[PDB]
Design a protein around this ligand. Structure first.
Ligand SMILES: NC(=O)C1=CN([C@@H]2O[C@H](COP(=O)(O)OP(=O)(O)OC[C@H]3O[C@@H](n4cnc5c(N)ncnc54)[C@H](OP(=O)(O)O)[C@@H]3O)[C@@H](O)[C@H]2O)C=CC1
Ligand SMILES: CC[C@@H](C#Cc1c(C)nc(N)nc1N)c1cc(OC)c(OC)c(OC)c1
Length: 225
């Protein structure tokens, strides 16, 4: 009953997200968006959860982790159980799926979690296409004179577009209420695809905050007792 939201910054057209254990760009304004969206809540007495693969945890500078003011969950197959507190602000889980089931228990969470953000791993993102209710995708494009950065990790665009549609018309309303953006909603063509969302430019890059939402589903079966 808590929304599960993938949040990722991806370079078009291949949707590259990483290179050699790190982000392929350093964009302060995109960091800011990610920080604000995952931190802020509409209900002041709730926090969000952020879930991340082990390798992504290890990529965060020691100073900056665990991410302040959000419940941090790190998943590793070598960890001990489905959701276990190991330190202030840090939970360990040995299973993405079971930790999500554990976070959803209103007995455990007291209805004091507002959203669950999946904040990456390429490998984590691969397994979240079936788990996430929405995706917040920052679609990044190199500007004309900008060198395309090398990349070795990618968002699964095929599986995204199978399950989700571009709901970016509703991006503004979706975001926690107290965030202000600099763009207006814009639809732009870029290398033969439609890019729609809230525009920013920084360094050699143009980027759009977008929202994707699960497509409507037919009613095939509902479990009865
Ligand atoms: N552009 C963006 O918005 C973002 C990009 N990235 C990028 O992604 C890259 C890292 O991704 P990747 O290398 O795929 O690693 P991940 O961050 O996805 O972590 C992979 C590890 O997570 C653990 N794991 C995976 N699935 C599960 C599961 N189902 N249950 C329990 N543990 C699991 C395993 O850990 P173990 O081996 O210990 O068992 C696995 O080795 C980096 O380049 C990073 O910069 C990361 C976040 C955001
Ligand atoms: C936790 C993984 C990654 C991310 C992301 C991420 C970003 C940037 N943007 C979007 N739209 N989605 C994401 N999921 C990240 C790496 C860092 O070290 C280099 C961070 O410290 C500075 C950081 O704190 C902010 C966050």
């Amino acid at each position: 009953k808590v929304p599960v939201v993938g949040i990722v910054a991806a370079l078009l057209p291949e949707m590259g997200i990483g290179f050699q254990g790190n982000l392929p760009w350093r964009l302060a304004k995109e960091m800011k968006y990610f920080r604000e969206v995952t931190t802020l809540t509409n209900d002041n007495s709730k926090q969000n959860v952020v879930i991340m693969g082990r390798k992504t945890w290890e990529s965060i500078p020691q100073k900056f982790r665990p991410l302040p003011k959000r419940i941090n969950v790190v998943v590793s197959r070598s960890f001990d159980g489905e959701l276990r507190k190991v330190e202030d602000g840090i939970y360990h889980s040995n299973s993405l799926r079971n930790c999500l089931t554990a976070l959803q228990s209103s007995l455990a969470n007291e209805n004091k979690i507002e959203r669950i953000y999946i904040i990456g791993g390429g490998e984590i993102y691969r397994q979240s296409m079936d788990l996430a209710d929405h995706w917040l995708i920052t679609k990044i494009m190199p500007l004309p004179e900008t060198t395309i950065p090398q990349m070795d990790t990618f968002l699964q665009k095929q599986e995204l577009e199978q399950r989700f549609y571009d709901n970016s018309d509703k991006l503004v309303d979706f975001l926690p209420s107290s965030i202000q953006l600099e763009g207006r909603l814009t639809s732009q063509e870029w290398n033969g695809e439609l890019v729609k969302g809230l525009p920013v430019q920084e360094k050699g890059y143009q980027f759009y905050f977008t929202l994707y939402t699960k497509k409507l589903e037919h009613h095939h079966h509902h479990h009865h007792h």
